[PDB]
Amino acid sequence: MAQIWLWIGVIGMALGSIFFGIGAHNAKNERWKILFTINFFICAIATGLYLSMALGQGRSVIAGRPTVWVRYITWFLSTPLLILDLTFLGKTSLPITASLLGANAYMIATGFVATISADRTIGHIWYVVSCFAFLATVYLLVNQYRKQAERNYPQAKKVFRKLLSVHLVLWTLYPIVWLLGNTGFNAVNQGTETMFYTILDITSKVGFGFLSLNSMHTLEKNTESV
Amino acid sequence: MAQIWLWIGVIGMALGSIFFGIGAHNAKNERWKILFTINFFICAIATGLYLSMALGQGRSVIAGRPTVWVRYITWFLSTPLLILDLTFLGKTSLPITASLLGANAYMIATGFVATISADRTIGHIWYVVSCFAFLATVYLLVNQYRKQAERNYPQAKKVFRKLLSVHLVLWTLYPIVWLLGNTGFNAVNQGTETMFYTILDITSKVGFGFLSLNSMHTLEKNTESV
């Protein structure tokens, strides 16, 4: 089960890569080229790292617990690009952008330590720290980021509502899966944990990628010159 | 002794984080927001990494020598932000900024190798290389950086004198502690080495943070419009 869902990961991310790549190549102006290029690299990075997992790499048995540590290398590289999707579309100020990228990096880094810690009590301390880093990003997104975006696009409030709704719901699912998996309560087997992360990853990357494109189109039409 | 001084580290950096965070949240313009945000992240990074050390992590016994390698992860991330404090306040040109960040990264990277090298002769070669990287930064700071800062703020020469004096004195203490510790002559026990680094870290982060804020206020008042 694990094996097939890793390969579905490779196929999904590779298909996302190709179509974002073709978009980037054909891009009508620099704004569209940039957005297509961010999403291409999110999906390209995820493809290669899913290939490593499918080939049996990036995994260690830590005190008897099978642990896919390469997964956090993927997240550390792809999640800031997903935040750049948001800050690009929102035309976010540098301090709030920096704060979002900082908190997110902190979330993933503490997430990594929470995972690879042999002492699972220490791991679970880091989980809580990581959740607080996520909460920091949630606060920044629904406050400073949203208000800046709404100020920049007064007629497109709903666009950023949809973007933030999808981001916040999908990203909250990750720490829930982490709790269900061998990292936490171990309520689901490795096959199921792998399926959950793969579906999450394809949705949060290819799914959110296409939503980011659709959102750019709506903003472009909404701000079209008379 | 080691244990308590690691926890004093956590408390100090966490208190620095909170007050810089509150400053950032309340920041009167983008210049103040940026400065508060840089210092928040210096102290936030240091908090989490001091928590890892206090919890017993980030440490290895290398050929019988207890070695806290995570300490250099902290320095590699926080020291460029401290340099950004200087280059932000000094409105430093991109090449000199880049040169400062480059030399500093080189210092910490060679510092790391100097530490984790099992062969202590090779370690001590890397110490000397790291000292020369520091000397490079000293030269850049007291020459190009200072002259640019003085050119930018002709009436605030003393501000940058105070900033550079505190930076140069505090940062020179680090390689001295390194020589006194198990990395060098082992003239002080692990408890004392830990106390020294903690006091240095709180001073160079929270201390220098507040000096950076005070300096910004002086520059803002000095350049206030008639």
Next chain:
Amino acid sequence: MAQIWLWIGVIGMALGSIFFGIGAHNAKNERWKILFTINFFICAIATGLYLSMALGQGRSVIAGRPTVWVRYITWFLSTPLLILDLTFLGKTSLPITASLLGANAYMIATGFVATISADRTIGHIWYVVSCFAFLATVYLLVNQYRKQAERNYPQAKKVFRKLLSVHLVLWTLYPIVWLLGNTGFNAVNQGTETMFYTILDITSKVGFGFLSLNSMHTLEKNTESV
């Protein structure tokens, strides 16, 4: 043989560092300062990492195969700076610059995995992936990069022809050496593999550095105001 050619590496990169450093110090304007500083850091990074290799570091025996993994740390840091040489001189757009840096990072990262993989079949999968990342960069360079450069300097088409010719020929030699070495067919001994990489590295860093300087002079004279 290996040992001497590592030390020739240290001497070559150190000599390149000094002369680029002296250029940077004496630089006539910010454009020359930036170009000199990029090339200084390419050569400075390479010096320190060649010193580590010469001192016997950064090497592991992976399932009986001696493997110099620190070599890919050098390439991961120095190769984007070499790309920055090109994008600086070409005044390349941000998306194409980003695409070049992204593909190059991907090439070196997959190159690294291709090397350290104990399973050499998996290694050779990663080699092919890495070659496709290189091909991506080749496409970007000879298309978008070249056309932007030619648009920016209509009278200096030959300058960028020379830059791209040297880049493409030299960089293609790396995957050939990789195939000849213990990573591939093992058709050459470790002494010869080391000599090849050292000569390549000095040429692609000091050699290309001086070509980048010469190219800047030609562009400056070609665009000199009447």
